[PDB]
Amino acid sequence: CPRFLKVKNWETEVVLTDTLHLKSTLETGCTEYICMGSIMHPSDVATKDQLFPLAKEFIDQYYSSIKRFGSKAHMERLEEVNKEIDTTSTYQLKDTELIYGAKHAWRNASRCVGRIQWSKLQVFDARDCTTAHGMFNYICNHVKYATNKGNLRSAITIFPQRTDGKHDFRVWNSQLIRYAGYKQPDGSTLGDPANVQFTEICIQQGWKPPRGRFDVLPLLLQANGNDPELFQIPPELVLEVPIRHPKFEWFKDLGLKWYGLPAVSNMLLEIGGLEFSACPFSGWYMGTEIGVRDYCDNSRYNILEEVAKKMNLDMRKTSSLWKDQALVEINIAVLYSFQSDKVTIVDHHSATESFIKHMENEYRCRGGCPADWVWIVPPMSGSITPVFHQEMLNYRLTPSFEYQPDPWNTHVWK
Amino acid sequence: PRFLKVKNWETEVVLTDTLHLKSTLETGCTEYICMGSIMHPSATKDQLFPLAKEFIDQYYSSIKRFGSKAHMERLEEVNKEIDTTSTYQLKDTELIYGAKHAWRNASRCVGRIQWSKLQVFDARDCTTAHGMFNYICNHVKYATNKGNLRSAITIFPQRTDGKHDFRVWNSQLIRYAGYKQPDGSTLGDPANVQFTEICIQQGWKPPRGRFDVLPLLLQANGNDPELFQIPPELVLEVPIRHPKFEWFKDLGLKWYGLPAVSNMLLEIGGLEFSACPFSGWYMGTEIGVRDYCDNSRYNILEEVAKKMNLDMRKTSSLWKDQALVEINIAVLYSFQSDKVTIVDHHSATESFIKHMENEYRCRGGCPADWVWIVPPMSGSITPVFHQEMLNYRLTPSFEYQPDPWNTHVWK
Ligand code: HEM
Ligand code: HEM
Ligand SMILES: CN[C@@H](C)Cc1cc(C#N)cc(OCc2ccc3c(C)cc(N)nc3c2)c1
Ligand SMILES: CN[C@@H](C)Cc1cc(C#N)cc(OCc2ccc3c(C)cc(N)nc3c2)c1
Ligand SMILES: C[C@H](O)[C@H](O)[C@H]1CNc2nc(N)[nH]c(=O)c2N1
Ligand SMILES: C[C@H](O)[C@H](O)[C@H]1CNc2nc(N)[nH]c(=O)c2N1
Ligand SMILES: [Zn+2]
């Protein structure tokens, strides 16, 4: 209960009706008496009996999408998978199923504002991979293809699935391209403070760090449960953008740059009960991700103060909104720079307007669209974007991208 | 089951929530569906006494006299009043305790660090709209205090058989009128166009200006509501001007000093107070972001950006964002210069983080709606963005209720 749930937009009064929520799979963390919608994470292998029903649910869904439900091919496929599970305790997805499942894990990502693009996703099948060097090769081809000389194209590379859990493939990097952070003996931090831990691990694994402010990190790659291995990404594959400002000539003097390709590589892709622990995917940036969070978080590069000083701002009282003012200019500079270098990027106004349109269409064609308001609303100027006033329902559909523990906590070193 | 941790991801501070286990009202969410962004997820004597007992229990627990002679006596007193009269009346102390804790339990309010500095005016002896007018005038005058605003609530008689409700039909004691123009646009505040028409329907003579203070529309004891004009000397207003942009005053914007929400229902120990206007002071973004820049509101971004001579052809110039900051700078500067109490979203969110820490320490938790606590501009550079919160509904509480004109049958 109940079969229908309505959502309202308070700016346009448009009302949508959600039926899709009935296919919700996992719990949210919420209950009837408490809501955990702003908890970041409100959360060995699957057995045979656990697995048939999960496999059947996905196979049914797949044949339902290609308008072949209850067909000979549908029934044959079910028998094939069931027997494979019974004799091998797992099964293998057909290429078509893998591609469908990957696109739908994105489509089901309630925290992603970018989902209007979900069906155009290049899927690279890397399930024949056996070694870290091969992971490196696949990852390089992913980066080059996705980057496309600035004209970014979303893609995902999927490595072999978990078997017994002692042979996992993992990208130890949280993103394929990130900058190193170095904590200094005086307590201060050079580079990106978000990445200090991973940096220290790379250095321990033998990485010789240049110890600069924007040193691209090496790939740390684990195949088939083996100790991970370091590889330098070829610099010519790493597209970068110097941040300048269209009016403040001094902004370049800050010496800021960022990388063009956002590629998240530490999440788990779940399809019909199968677990792909290495599945790096990439899109293009929303400006705020760099300009608000990456640059202006106190736990990040934290340049608000420095920018505001160069803007001659009164910085003694907060009620002057010097931070707010600085933040806007910084995000203006980010968008300007990317646009000027013909590197794909979306501003938070465009993106949120697109998501609203995507959401409504999803309600029309699919009977709903799970969305996480806390993550969908941009980290600046929320109420002047249309998502702010839009009621949303959040729930877990499958296939899905999931969080997984950092590998260095679980790895049994050889 | 279980204590629950919330984590601040900026400071890594972790608080342990136990208070949620005393929650008894539902949130709207389920195991499988979160509804945290739905605005509103949708008595006889038999139901009343347990509700009453629960409130009395926690009251005497608050004054450290649980199980006392007076406590048990109060219980036998309330029970006897309920089967006799099908209701019961709160002691003055219980009323004060009740009102403050309804503020304290308000998940959506970032101003709760002030919750126990609340001036309670008991207006349960009121019988007429004229009496209601008088109580309200005294509230406004006391709360405004010449710009040094003071928090207050005025509580009118509780609901009885539901046919004799007291209602303030205004959504705030002080609001500006909104008029549906001949060309289909809107003069004044567009959020109030319906209420404004209702007042005109009752005989209000509209100045049909941009910032016309609406009359009070007051319903006593289930009777038809009556119009009253607030004496203008009680209505503190601020001309909005900019510290650097001299042309900003030429926009001709003003706002009122006193935010006084008057359309909610106060629930204490099973008793329903359908008229209970409460007031505090403004966080600047309430006016500068919402009242002024919401598309369904005054919507002045366009005009301001023009005066700032910004590039407005493409959205990726963040011209809306720039104009928004300036408007909010103007609002804070204007109130401050006129010595009218106001708080900015940086200072307000700081205070709330400190308030959370207090409540976890002394109360074992604090219900908080991240969706409403995070300010509508500059979210992630305020400390509440990075603050995990748990949301649950404690009682006493403020509740939503229907607009009286959807319910009321005239005579
Ligand atoms: C194509 C352009 C895309 C844009 C503009 C975009 C935008 C965003 C943004 C702004 C976030 C919030 C990020 C944060 O605050 O950390 C997000 C989250 C997310 N995105 Fe997208 N994204 C894009 C592509 C993709 C693709 C291709 C996938 C998967 C195939 C994807 C999957 C996800 C997931 C799973 C999350 C949430 C991660 C979590 O649960 O913490 N996105 N996206
Ligand atoms: C003293 C200064 C106060 C400040 C700065 C403040 C701030 C705020 C803000 C910014 C909101 C969000 C409003 C919106 O965006 O519509 C809010 C909501 C709320 N406030 Fe406060 N507040 C204050 C005092 C009070 C008082 C005195 C009461 C009652 C005793 C109160 C009860 C509430 C309630 C019940 C809500 C949520 C209403 C809803 O559920 O829609 N607040 N507050
Ligand atoms: C500082 N807080 C972050 C660490 C939270 C976060 C964690 C993880 C994980 N694991 C994954 C996350 O993914 C966000 C994300 C994922 C994919 C994106 C793509 C493909 C494109 C894009 N522009 N942004 C993305 C943003 C975020
Ligand atoms: C446009 N969205 C609003 C209509 C949502 C809203 C509804 C109601 C009701 N009923 C009551 C609301 O009250 C918000 C509120 C309540 C009290 C406040 C006090 C006492 C002070 C202050 N500065 N802001 C307040 C803000 C809001
Ligand atoms: C505490 C809070 O839930 C947490 O900081 C969330 C809030 N919303 C967010 N939204 C986005 N897009 N990204 C984030 O990292 C976060 N962080
Ligand atoms: C749909 C959504 O819940 C609604 O627009 C909320 C979002 N957060 C808000 N937060 C505050 N403070 N005030 C509001 O009116 C709203 N509106
Ligand atoms: Zn919830």
Coordinates of C-alpha atoms and ligand atoms in Angstrom, one line a residue, chain A residues 28-31 34-38 394, chain B residues 27-30 33-37 391, ligand 7:
Chain A
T28 CA 16.2 2.9 2.1
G29 CA 17.3 3.1 5.7
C30 CA 14.2 5.1 6.5
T31 CA 11.3 3.8 8.5
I34 CA 12.5 8.0 11.1
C35 CA 13.9 9.5 7.9
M36 CA 17.5 9.1 6.9
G37 CA 17.4 10.9 3.6
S38 CA 20.5 13.0 4.4
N394 CA 13.6 8.1 -3.4
Chain B
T27 CA 7.4 10.6 9.1
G28 CA 5.8 9.6 5.9
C29 CA 8.8 7.4 4.8
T30 CA 8.9 3.6 4.6
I33 CA 10.5 4.7 -0.1
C34 CA 12.0 7.9 1.3
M35 CA 9.7 10.9 1.2
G36 CA 12.0 13.5 2.8
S37 CA 11.2 16.1 0.1
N391 CA 14.4 13.4 11.1
Ligands
ZN7 ZN 13.2 9.3 4.4

